[PDB]
Amino acid sequence: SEFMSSLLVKKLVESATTPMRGSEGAAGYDISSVEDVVVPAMGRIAVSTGISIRVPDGTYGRIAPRSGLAYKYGIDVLAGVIDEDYTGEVKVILYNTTERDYIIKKGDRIAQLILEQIVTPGVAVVLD
Amino acid sequence: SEFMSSLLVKKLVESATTPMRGSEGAAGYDISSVEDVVVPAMGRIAVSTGISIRVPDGTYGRIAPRSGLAYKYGIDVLAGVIDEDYTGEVKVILYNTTERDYIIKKGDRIAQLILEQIVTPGVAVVLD
Amino acid sequence: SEFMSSLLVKKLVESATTPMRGSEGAAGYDISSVEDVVVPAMGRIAVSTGISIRVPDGTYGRIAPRSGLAYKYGIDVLAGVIDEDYTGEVKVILYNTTERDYIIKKGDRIAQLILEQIVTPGVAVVLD
Ligand SMILES: O=c1ccn([C@H]2C[C@H](O)[C@@H](COP(=O)(O)OP(=O)(O)O)O2)c(=O)[nH]1
Ligand SMILES: O=c1ccn([C@H]2C[C@H](O)[C@@H](COP(=O)(O)OP(=O)(O)O)O2)c(=O)[nH]1
Ligand SMILES: O=c1ccn([C@H]2C[C@H](O)[C@@H](COP(=O)(O)OP(=O)(O)O)O2)c(=O)[nH]1
Ligand SMILES: [Mg+2]
């Protein structure tokens, strides 16, 4: 591959932001919003990222929560499992744990992508 | 092993469903319920899967949320860490984020199993 | 490395507990509290662990929920992503899903650390 076994990103909207790690030791690639939305108090919402992704073979893309938002605004990430064979747009489902709404302006880093190494064997069913 | 390093599944109840990936690129193996239960609004519940599993060495089984259920019914997965040395029955703890109960009929895919590769070294305690 | 590619732990407070797996097949290293705190009903809180950690290269440290606490007290773990380049103190953000507060005495195992293998390639942006 030379290195086509990396994170293939395709911006769908011009407004989109290329995912990027914020440190040499960072685990995930920052993931920003492409729209202005409000995560309802005690409610959820799916934020468009405006990008599609192709995870490296042997891994899946887990949308994990950013420490900041979790801490300060009790924001959590629901679902978050992006299959290697997913060609659609990455949507980020946020859940407001707090009693007060949460504002999201375009461009904001609303989550982070982690390329988690998984194993995808077959199922050996044990009879007796 | 030839391939005994795959997902060993043992149905405990005849009603059980063998976990299975739904795509070539899917990350997890579908996980169905073996009973009819209701996930209480704003409450949780542990759904029996009726199966026991033996994860491949070098990984653990993370019970992750299905995108659909998360999106449409604000259903989330609590706990979800199945150790390689777990011989009991896989129980799936679902949490209803919504204001309205959620019905689960036997056979339904209530979560997905992901064989996540972990490293299990020893702890090197740094003194001074 | 010989084996300096293991979980490097540095107790910050004498009161701290060295993370440790509770089984040969356990996926995570137990993580205890270093203080007496209360996880507010329907609220969150960041529990100090009194330790700093250096994850092995090629992985990140995911703070996962303990099955017990999740089941019995509807306790969940928010955020939970500790980067390999994190030199600060591991803080554990717990979220009380239940209607009743949750007490945490010093020494208690409040979560578990899982050294999850990730891949950290570069981003190949697909133009046209
Ligand atoms: O539950 C958690 C989650 C994260 N961290 C630490 C690990 C990581 O190295 C650091 C990340 O801070 P940040 O990512 O630089 O700020 P942000 O999450 O807003 O990007 O916080 C914790 O101690 N506990
Ligand atoms: O937060 C999420 C979770 C999943 N997906 C995408 C990735 C995956 O490829 C697809 C999965 O749809 P599905 O699994 O086929 O439907 P279901 O989750 O009900 O099995 O949804 C997102 O965009 N955002
Ligand atoms: O959603 C879950 C989470 C865990 N387990 C199983 C897998 C694991 O092998 C066992 C762990 O029990 P424990 O870790 O020994 O008790 P505790 O979580 O309090 O440490 O529970 C489940 O069946 N379902
Ligand atoms: Mg939650």
Author numbering:
A (entry chain A), B (entry chain A), C (entry chain A): -2 to 125
Publication passage describing the model:
dUTPase (EC 3.6.1.23) is a ubiquitous enzyme that catalyzes the hydrolysis of dUTP to diphosphate and dUMP, the substrate for thymidylate synthetase in dTTP biosynthesis. The 141-amino-acid deoxyuridine triphosphatase (dUTPase) from the algal Chlorella virus IL-3A and its Glu81Ser/Thr84Arg-mutant derivative Mu-22 were crystallized using the hanging-drop vapor-diffusion method at 298 K with polyethylene glycol as the precipitant. We previously generated Mu-22 dUTPase by mutating two IL-3A residues to the corresponding residues from PBCV-1 dUTPase. The presence of these two mutations (Glu81Ser and Thr84Arg), creating the derivative Mu-22 dUTPase, led to an increase in the optimal temperature of the enzyme to 328 K. Here, we conduct structural studies of dUTPases from Chlorella viruses in order to elucidate the molecular mechanisms behind the differences in optimal temperature.
An apo IL-3A dUTPase with an amino-terminal T7 epitope tag and a carboxy-terminal histidine tag yielded cubic P213 crystals with unit-cell parameter a = 106.65 Å.
